[PDB]
Tab-separated table of all heavy atoms in Angstrom:
chain	number	residue	atom	x	y	z
A	1	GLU	N	-97.914	197.997	140.790
A	1	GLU	CA	-98.187	197.145	141.948
A	1	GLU	C	-98.014	197.962	143.221
A	1	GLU	O	-97.229	197.602	144.092
A	1	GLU	CB	-97.238	195.944	142.004
A	1	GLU	CG	-97.341	194.982	140.841
A	1	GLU	CD	-96.575	193.690	141.092
A	1	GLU	OE1	-96.242	193.411	142.264
A	1	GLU	OE2	-96.314	192.950	140.121
A	2	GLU	N	-98.749	199.064	143.315
A	2	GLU	CA	-98.675	199.944	144.473
A	2	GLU	C	-99.304	199.283	145.697
A	2	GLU	O	-100.474	198.897	145.670
A	2	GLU	CB	-99.401	201.255	144.166
A	2	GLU	CG	-98.973	202.430	145.023
A	2	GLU	CD	-98.052	203.382	144.275
A	2	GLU	OE1	-97.018	202.927	143.743
A	2	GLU	OE2	-98.366	204.590	144.221
A	3	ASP	N	-98.525	199.158	146.769
A	3	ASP	CA	-99.010	198.547	148.005
A	3	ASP	C	-100.316	199.202	148.435
A	3	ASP	O	-100.372	200.413	148.629
A	3	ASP	CB	-97.969	198.711	149.117
A	3	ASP	CG	-98.419	198.105	150.440
A	3	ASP	OD1	-99.519	197.511	150.498
A	3	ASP	OD2	-97.665	198.223	151.432
A	4	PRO	N	-101.383	198.406	148.594
A	4	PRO	CA	-102.692	198.928	149.002
A	4	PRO	C	-102.617	199.772	150.268
A	4	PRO	O	-103.421	200.680	150.466
A	4	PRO	CB	-103.519	197.662	149.203
A	4	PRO	CG	-102.944	196.734	148.178
A	4	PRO	CD	-101.455	196.955	148.347
A	5	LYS	N	-101.640	199.465	151.114
A	5	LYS	CA	-101.446	200.178	152.374
A	5	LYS	C	-101.142	201.657	152.170
A	5	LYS	O	-101.418	202.473	153.042
A	5	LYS	CB	-100.300	199.539	153.164
A	5	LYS	CG	-100.394	198.022	153.298
A	5	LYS	CD	-101.622	197.598	154.092
A	5	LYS	CE	-101.707	196.085	154.202
A	5	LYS	NZ	-101.824	195.445	152.862
A	6	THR	N	-100.574	202.002	151.017
A	6	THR	CA	-100.225	203.390	150.727
A	6	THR	C	-100.900	203.906	149.458
A	6	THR	O	-100.563	204.982	148.952
A	6	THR	CB	-98.705	203.540	150.553
A	6	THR	OG1	-98.290	202.845	149.371
A	6	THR	CG2	-97.975	202.949	151.755
A	7	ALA	N	-101.853	203.137	148.949
A	7	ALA	CA	-102.561	203.500	147.730
A	7	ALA	C	-103.459	204.723	147.888
A	7	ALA	O	-104.099	204.913	148.920
A	7	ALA	CB	-103.384	202.315	147.247
A	8	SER	N	-103.497	205.549	146.849
A	8	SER	CA	-104.324	206.750	146.837
A	8	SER	C	-105.791	206.351	146.931
A	8	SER	O	-106.133	205.176	146.802
A	8	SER	CB	-104.119	207.512	145.531
A	8	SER	OG	-104.636	206.766	144.439
A	9	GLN	N	-106.655	207.337	147.139
A	9	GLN	CA	-108.084	207.082	147.235
A	9	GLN	C	-108.655	206.537	145.930
A	9	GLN	O	-109.473	205.612	145.946
A	9	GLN	CB	-108.837	208.359	147.623
A	9	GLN	CG	-108.896	208.625	149.119
A	9	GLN	CD	-110.315	208.886	149.595
A	9	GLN	OE1	-110.997	209.794	149.101
A	9	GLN	NE2	-110.773	208.088	150.556
A	10	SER	N	-108.230	207.106	144.806
A	10	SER	CA	-108.714	206.658	143.506
A	10	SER	C	-108.276	205.227	143.220
A	10	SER	O	-109.042	204.438	142.670
A	10	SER	CB	-108.216	207.581	142.393
A	10	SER	OG	-106.803	207.535	142.280
A	11	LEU	N	-107.042	204.893	143.594
A	11	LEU	CA	-106.522	203.548	143.368
A	11	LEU	C	-107.260	202.533	144.240
A	11	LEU	O	-107.628	201.456	143.767
A	11	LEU	CB	-105.017	203.486	143.658
A	11	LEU	CG	-104.361	202.098	143.614
A	11	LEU	CD1	-104.607	201.436	142.279
A	11	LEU	CD2	-102.864	202.225	143.866
A	12	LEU	N	-107.471	202.869	145.510
A	12	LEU	CA	-108.187	201.968	146.405
A	12	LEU	C	-109.569	201.665	145.841
A	12	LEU	O	-110.023	200.522	145.865
A	12	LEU	CB	-108.328	202.576	147.802
A	12	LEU	CG	-107.128	202.462	148.744
A	12	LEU	CD1	-107.471	203.106	150.084
A	12	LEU	CD2	-106.766	200.992	148.944
A	13	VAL	N	-110.240	202.696	145.342
A	13	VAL	CA	-111.567	202.523	144.761
A	13	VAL	C	-111.492	201.450	143.688
A	13	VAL	O	-112.292	200.508	143.665
A	13	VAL	CB	-112.068	203.826	144.126
A	13	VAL	CG1	-113.351	203.573	143.350
A	13	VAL	CG2	-112.306	204.864	145.218
A	14	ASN	N	-110.503	201.592	142.813
A	14	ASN	CA	-110.307	200.651	141.726
A	14	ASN	C	-109.987	199.246	142.238
A	14	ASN	O	-110.582	198.268	141.788
A	14	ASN	CB	-109.191	201.146	140.803
A	14	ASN	CG	-109.567	202.427	140.068
A	14	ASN	OD1	-110.709	202.593	139.651
A	14	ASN	ND2	-108.600	203.327	139.892
A	15	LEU	N	-109.061	199.146	143.185
A	15	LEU	CA	-108.684	197.845	143.722
A	15	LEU	C	-109.853	197.166	144.436
A	15	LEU	O	-110.059	195.961	144.289
A	15	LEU	CB	-107.496	197.996	144.678
A	15	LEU	CG	-106.205	198.537	144.054
A	15	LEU	CD1	-105.189	198.831	145.151
A	15	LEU	CD2	-105.640	197.529	143.071
A	16	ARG	N	-110.615	197.940	145.206
A	16	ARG	CA	-111.767	197.408	145.926
A	16	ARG	C	-112.789	196.849	144.950
A	16	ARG	O	-113.379	195.793	145.192
A	16	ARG	CB	-112.438	198.496	146.770
A	16	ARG	CG	-111.653	198.952	147.992
A	16	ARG	CD	-112.332	200.154	148.637
A	16	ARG	NE	-111.540	200.725	149.721
A	16	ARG	CZ	-111.614	201.996	150.104
A	16	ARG	NH1	-112.446	202.826	149.486
A	16	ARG	NH2	-110.858	202.439	151.098
A	17	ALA	N	-113.017	197.564	143.853
A	17	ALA	CA	-113.978	197.096	142.867
A	17	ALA	C	-113.482	195.768	142.295
A	17	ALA	O	-114.249	194.819	142.147
A	17	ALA	CB	-114.143	198.120	141.769
A	18	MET	N	-112.189	195.694	141.991
A	18	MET	CA	-111.627	194.462	141.453
A	18	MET	C	-111.804	193.327	142.447
A	18	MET	O	-112.260	192.239	142.094
A	18	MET	CB	-110.142	194.638	141.144
A	18	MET	CG	-109.875	195.465	139.908
A	18	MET	SD	-108.139	195.493	139.498
A	18	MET	CE	-107.752	197.215	139.794
A	19	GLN	N	-111.434	193.590	143.693
A	19	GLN	CA	-111.549	192.596	144.747
A	19	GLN	C	-112.979	192.077	144.849
A	19	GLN	O	-113.200	190.872	144.933
A	19	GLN	CB	-111.118	193.203	146.078
A	19	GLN	CG	-111.136	192.216	147.227
A	19	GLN	CD	-110.348	192.708	148.416
A	19	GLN	OE1	-109.118	192.756	148.381
A	19	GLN	NE2	-111.051	193.089	149.478
A	20	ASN	N	-113.944	192.990	144.837
A	20	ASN	CA	-115.352	192.615	144.932
A	20	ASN	C	-115.761	191.715	143.775
A	20	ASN	O	-116.455	190.714	143.972
A	20	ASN	CB	-116.255	193.854	144.929
A	20	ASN	CG	-116.111	194.694	146.183
A	20	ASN	OD1	-115.664	194.210	147.223
A	20	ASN	ND2	-116.514	195.961	146.097
A	21	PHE	N	-115.333	192.076	142.569
A	21	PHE	CA	-115.679	191.308	141.386
A	21	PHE	C	-115.139	189.892	141.468
A	21	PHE	O	-115.820	188.931	141.103
A	21	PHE	CB	-115.144	191.994	140.124
A	21	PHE	CG	-115.523	191.294	138.853
A	21	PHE	CD1	-116.732	191.579	138.224
A	21	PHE	CD2	-114.703	190.312	138.310
A	21	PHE	CE1	-117.120	190.892	137.070
A	21	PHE	CE2	-115.082	189.621	137.157
A	21	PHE	CZ	-116.290	189.909	136.536
A	22	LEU	N	-113.909	189.770	141.947
A	22	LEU	CA	-113.274	188.472	142.070
A	22	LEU	C	-114.022	187.550	143.039
A	22	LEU	O	-113.923	186.334	142.933
A	22	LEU	CB	-111.816	188.640	142.518
A	22	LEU	CG	-110.882	189.220	141.454
A	22	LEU	CD1	-109.484	189.364	142.015
A	22	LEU	CD2	-110.877	188.307	140.243
A	23	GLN	N	-114.768	188.130	143.971
A	23	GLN	CA	-115.527	187.337	144.936
A	23	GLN	C	-116.759	186.705	144.302
A	23	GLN	O	-117.410	185.868	144.918
A	23	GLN	CB	-115.955	188.202	146.133
A	23	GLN	CG	-114.798	188.693	146.993
A	23	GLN	CD	-115.233	189.701	148.052
A	23	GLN	OE1	-114.400	190.291	148.747
A	23	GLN	NE2	-116.544	189.900	148.178
A	24	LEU	N	-117.087	187.103	143.078
A	24	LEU	CA	-118.248	186.535	142.400
A	24	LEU	C	-117.954	185.087	142.029
A	24	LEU	O	-116.798	184.692	141.944
A	24	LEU	CB	-118.576	187.332	141.130
A	24	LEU	CG	-118.975	188.795	141.344
A	24	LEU	CD1	-119.207	189.479	140.006
A	24	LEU	CD2	-120.238	188.847	142.197
A	25	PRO	N	-119.002	184.270	141.822
A	25	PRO	CA	-118.798	182.863	141.455
A	25	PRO	C	-118.004	182.776	140.156
A	25	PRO	O	-118.192	183.597	139.259
A	25	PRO	CB	-120.222	182.338	141.288
A	25	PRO	CG	-120.995	183.165	142.263
A	25	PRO	CD	-120.434	184.552	142.027
A	26	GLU	N	-117.131	181.779	140.052
A	26	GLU	CA	-116.316	181.611	138.855
A	26	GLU	C	-117.157	181.533	137.585
A	26	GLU	O	-116.813	182.129	136.568
A	26	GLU	CB	-115.449	180.359	138.974
A	26	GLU	CG	-114.483	180.173	137.811
A	26	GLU	CD	-113.547	178.996	138.012
A	26	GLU	OE1	-112.649	179.078	138.880
A	26	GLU	OE2	-113.718	177.985	137.303
A	27	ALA	N	-118.265	180.805	137.647
A	27	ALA	CA	-119.138	180.672	136.492
A	27	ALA	C	-119.695	182.029	136.083
A	27	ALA	O	-119.812	182.323	134.894
A	27	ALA	CB	-120.288	179.707	136.802
A	28	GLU	N	-120.040	182.853	137.072
A	28	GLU	CA	-120.588	184.174	136.781
A	28	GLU	C	-119.530	185.116	136.217
A	28	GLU	O	-119.812	185.885	135.304
A	28	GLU	CB	-121.229	184.801	138.024
A	28	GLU	CG	-121.899	186.139	137.702
A	28	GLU	CD	-122.968	186.552	138.698
A	28	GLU	OE1	-123.186	185.827	139.697
A	28	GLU	OE2	-123.595	187.613	138.474
A	29	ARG	N	-118.321	185.069	136.764
A	29	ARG	CA	-117.251	185.913	136.251
A	29	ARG	C	-117.027	185.533	134.785
A	29	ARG	O	-116.971	186.399	133.914
A	29	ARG	CB	-115.963	185.710	137.056
A	29	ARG	CG	-116.119	185.969	138.546
A	29	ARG	CD	-114.786	186.308	139.211
A	29	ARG	NE	-113.750	185.307	138.987
A	29	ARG	CZ	-113.599	184.196	139.702
A	29	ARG	NH1	-114.422	183.922	140.709
A	29	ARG	NH2	-112.603	183.363	139.423
A	30	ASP	N	-116.929	184.232	134.516
A	30	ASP	CA	-116.728	183.753	133.157
A	30	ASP	C	-117.879	184.123	132.222
A	30	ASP	O	-117.648	184.435	131.057
A	30	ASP	CB	-116.509	182.241	133.160
A	30	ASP	CG	-115.129	181.865	133.661
A	30	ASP	OD1	-114.271	182.770	133.735
A	30	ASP	OD2	-114.900	180.679	133.973
A	31	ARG	N	-119.113	184.092	132.716
A	31	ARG	CA	-120.247	184.463	131.871
A	31	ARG	C	-120.128	185.945	131.543
A	31	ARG	O	-120.366	186.363	130.411
A	31	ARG	CB	-121.586	184.194	132.572
A	31	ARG	CG	-122.783	184.782	131.825
A	31	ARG	CD	-124.132	184.408	132.443
A	31	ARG	NE	-124.157	184.570	133.895
A	31	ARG	CZ	-123.973	183.572	134.758
A	31	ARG	NH1	-123.757	182.342	134.309
A	31	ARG	NH2	-123.996	183.803	136.066
A	32	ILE	N	-119.748	186.735	132.540
A	32	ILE	CA	-119.583	188.171	132.352
A	32	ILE	C	-118.484	188.473	131.319
A	32	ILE	O	-118.660	189.326	130.448
A	32	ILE	CB	-119.277	188.854	133.710
A	32	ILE	CG1	-120.552	188.872	134.565
A	32	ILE	CG2	-118.763	190.273	133.497
A	32	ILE	CD1	-120.341	189.300	136.019
A	33	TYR	N	-117.366	187.759	131.400
A	33	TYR	CA	-116.267	187.961	130.454
A	33	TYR	C	-116.697	187.604	129.029
A	33	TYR	O	-116.367	188.311	128.082
A	33	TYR	CB	-115.071	187.074	130.807
A	33	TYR	CG	-114.450	187.278	132.167
A	33	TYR	CD1	-113.893	186.201	132.851
A	33	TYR	CD2	-114.365	188.537	132.747
A	33	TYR	CE1	-113.269	186.373	134.079
A	33	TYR	CE2	-113.738	188.721	133.975
A	33	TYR	CZ	-113.194	187.632	134.638
A	33	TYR	OH	-112.584	187.786	135.864
A	34	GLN	N	-117.406	186.489	128.878
A	34	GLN	CA	-117.849	186.036	127.560
A	34	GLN	C	-118.734	187.056	126.847
A	34	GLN	O	-118.597	187.271	125.647
A	34	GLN	CB	-118.606	184.701	127.660
A	34	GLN	CG	-117.845	183.585	128.368
A	34	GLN	CD	-116.508	183.260	127.716
A	34	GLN	OE1	-115.600	182.732	128.371
A	34	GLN	NE2	-116.382	183.564	126.423
A	35	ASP	N	-119.644	187.685	127.577
A	35	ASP	CA	-120.519	188.664	126.953
A	35	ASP	C	-119.791	189.954	126.605
A	35	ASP	O	-120.043	190.545	125.555
A	35	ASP	CB	-121.713	188.964	127.851
A	35	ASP	CG	-122.634	187.774	127.998
A	35	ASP	OD1	-122.800	187.023	127.010
A	35	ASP	OD2	-123.198	187.591	129.098
A	36	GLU	N	-118.887	190.385	127.481
A	36	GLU	CA	-118.129	191.608	127.247
A	36	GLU	C	-117.190	191.424	126.068
A	36	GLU	O	-116.967	192.354	125.301
A	36	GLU	CB	-117.329	191.990	128.497
A	36	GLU	CG	-116.504	193.270	128.366
A	36	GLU	CD	-117.323	194.457	127.886
A	36	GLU	OE1	-118.542	194.499	128.167
A	36	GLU	OE2	-116.743	195.357	127.238
């Protein structure tokens, strides 16, 4: 749980991707999870 404020570049990349994904519609996130 590294504070984003001090997170490395690689970690930020990862966190940003997660954040972006979470912004997707709930139905779409769930559809994506079901197929994976």
